[PDB]
Amino acid sequence: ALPELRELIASFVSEEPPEIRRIRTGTVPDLPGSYGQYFTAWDFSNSIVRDYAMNLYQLTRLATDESVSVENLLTVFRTLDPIYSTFLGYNGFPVLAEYAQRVGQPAESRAELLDRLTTFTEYVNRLTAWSHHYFPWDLGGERYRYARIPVRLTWQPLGVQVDAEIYADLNPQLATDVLKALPFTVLQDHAVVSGESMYAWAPLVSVAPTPVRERICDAPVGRLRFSQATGNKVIVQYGPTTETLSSPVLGKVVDSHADRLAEVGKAVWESTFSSKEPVWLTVERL
Amino acid sequence: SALPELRELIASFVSEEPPEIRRIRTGTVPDLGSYGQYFTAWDFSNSIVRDYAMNLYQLTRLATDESVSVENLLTVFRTLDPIYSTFLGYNGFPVLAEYAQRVGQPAESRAELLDRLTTFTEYVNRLTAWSHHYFPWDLGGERYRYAQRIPVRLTWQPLGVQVDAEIYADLNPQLATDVLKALPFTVLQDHAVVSGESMYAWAPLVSVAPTPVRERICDAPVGRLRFSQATGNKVIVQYGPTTETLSSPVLGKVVDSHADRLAEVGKAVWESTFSSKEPVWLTVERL
Ligand SMILES: O=C(O)CC[C@]1(C(=O)O)N[C@H](C(=O)O)Cc2c1[nH]c1ccccc21
Ligand SMILES: O=C(O)CC[C@]1(C(=O)O)N[C@H](C(=O)O)Cc2c1[nH]c1ccccc21
Question: Which Pfam families match (chain B) (predicted)?
């Protein structure tokens, strides 16, 4: 459907998109940002592309709902998309805006529209992944400070390796979807709002049901969860949190390897919040 | 009114800062880990409530499209809303997430659903308005530097600056009628933080009017009045240049003999939104 987006998705799994490089260095054409700075444009670029990616996934889900006609889906997309994609096109993402218009073109079938949305969502998810990695989350930390399928996870250049287990029965189609994407190597980043957890944008768009979920605060060390709605992310719980929402249970790092995760979470913290030195997560079947 | 408490909160929040915004911007959201800082949660709260409001208006626009059934719309809302509202409910806006659920309930007619969406949209619009005013836009200021004719009156306090203006009632007729029906109002005046020298103020209405007559922003004269429904139903005042080649509905113009009075306001308004956060209040009234 969108063969060029497929090539860019394959490239950006290991290479920084030039869109993200220009935004974070303040070299976007036509210089966005009032009065000689580009932080405000950087703030809008990072957050809008993220929330745009959230809309695109929920629209992909809507494309699977057969109670809504294909013509209605296109009507919903043509109304909700432009205010986001037009701004993103003039603020660092011209290719994004290009294929946003193309996704909204008339579709011959629900399968074609779903194929556009699924491919376009993964492409925007990867732009969000890189944008999240390079956004200066510690900029305000100075003056806003408070008072059983076996698999293998590897973090480089840390060199840490752990064995894990995918639960293929709890969320069957979800586990199947993640297992189908193996092996992959993507950037490993940290949560920036809440919890001692890290997530990595995995190369897939799963619309599987998630009947089996577990409260985050009760998630054990080494818990493998997955978040479709925030970008199809593999999440590793390495420490405590008080958030009471529930996340789909994907798997668990084995008991004898779970104590190895604390040093990963600390380094992944340092990279997401400060140094921006890449940490690469590899997930593979054993 | 479908959600009358929201209407009450609308009336209050035009003049008073919502307690949620003050709690977020001071890091005092109760029981809210953020690793010994509250900037990141502030960053997500501000941007997500703004983009949530952007989705809600497009859903309000969809509510006037009779080719999409009311049942297909409620299906659309029930799928798109929770990822936004549940996050906002746990990060400072419990009342917003509480009423987001009531928006998605079964509706007896299209008019009842549109009334829910329009009211909820204006409520989240005012939350976004205050969050925009108080967000620390100067945080990266140092680190990331580059190398017929309807007569109306606009007054900015505490400056006391005053300009007469004309509303172009025959170009975007339904938009002009919607804006004129909201007069008089007094709202917070804030500055654009991305696209240069314009200032906008979230106006107390949700217009679903068509916007046929648009003019390139780079071509708008000093004193041009424009209006943006999709970014929060904002009255926009042009006072400086811009290279934006984008479209914006033409609403009116500050009269020629008063255009010199806008530079000092735009300078003072920028000082507020960007660093000082001292409120500048805009009153728009008929003449
Ligand atoms: O943090 C929360 O309150 C919710 C949990 C959450 C996650 O599932 O990863 N945390 C992320 C982070 O910390 O970066 C941000 C985030 C989460 N859900 C979200 C839903 C919508 C937008 C953003 C988020
Ligand atoms: O900035 C741009 O590139 C577009 C012009 C714009 C405006 O309509 O006022 N500027 C605003 C600002 O600077 O705060 C941000 C903004 C604008 N459209 C938008 C559309 C969607 C989201 C955000 C914006």
Answer: Cucumopine_C (PF18631)
Which of B133, B46, B55, B67 minimizes the C-alpha distance to B100? B55
Please report which ligand is nearest the Cα atom of A191: 1
Cβ–Cβ contact B140 with A under 8 A = yes
Q: What span, in angstroms and rounded, lies between the C-alpha atoms of A105 and A57?
A: 18
Cis peptide, bond prior to residue A211, ω within 30 of zero = no
Structure tokens at B263: 């530079």
Among B195, B200, B233, which residue has the most ligand 2 atoms within 8 Å of its CB, making it the best to mutate? B195
Q: What is the DSSP string of B159-180?
A: TTEEEEEEEETTTSHHHHHHHH
Instruction: Say yes or no for a CB contact (<8 Å) between B80 and A58.
Output: yes
The pair of three-digit structure tokens given for residue B40, joined into one six-digit string: 């990141």
Contacts of A260 (CB under 8 A, 6+ apart): A160, A161, A162
Q: How many inter-chain contacts (A to B, CB under 8 Å) are there?
A: 169
Experimentally, the structure was elucidated by X-ray
For residue A84, the chain B residues in CB contact (below 8 A) are 51, 54
List, as ranges, residues 235-274 from A with C-beta within 8 Å of B.
Answer: 241-243, 245, 269, 273
May I ask the CATH architecture of the domain A149-285? Beta Barrel (2.40)
| DSSP state, residue B135 | S
Q: Which chain B residues are Cβ-neighbours of A26 within 8 angstroms?
A: 144-146
Q: Which residue has the tokens 């609403």?
A: B251
Handedness of CA A22, A26, A29, A33 (dihedral sign): positive
Report the alpha-carbon distance of residue A23 to residue A41 in Å, rounded: 8
| Secondary structure (3-state) at B156 | strand
The domain segmentation of chain A, as residue ranges, is 3-134, 149-285
**Geometric angle at alpha carbon A77, from A75 and A83, rounded to 5°:** 120
Q: What angle, rounded to 10 degrees, do the helices at A39-64 and B39-63 form?
A: 50
Under CATH, what is the fold of the domain B149-286?
Cyclophilin (2.40.100)
**What is the CB < 6 Å shell around ligand 1?**
A 191-194, 227, 230, 243; B 44, 48, 83, 87, 90-91
CA–CA gap between residue A176 and residue A208 (Å, rounded) = 9
Instruction: With CA atoms as reference, report the closest residue to B10 among B233, B238, B287, B220.
Output: B233
For A95, residues 6+ apart whose C-beta sits below 8 A from its C-beta are: A8, A19
Residue of A nearest to B54 (CA): A83
Resolution reading in Å: 2.2
Per DSSP, chain A holds a count of helices (H) and strands (E) of 9, 10
- In degrees, rounded to 5, the angle at the alpha carbon of residue A74 between the alpha carbons of residues A69 and A77 is 125
**Joined tokens for residue A57:** 């996934």
Token code pair at residue A61: 């889900």
CB-based contact (8 Å) between A38 and chain B?
Answer: yes
> What is the C-alpha separation between A46 and A55, in angstroms, rounded?
15
Is A66 in CB contact (< 8 Å) with chain B? no
Q: How far is the CA of A54 from the centre of ligand 1 (A)?
A: 12
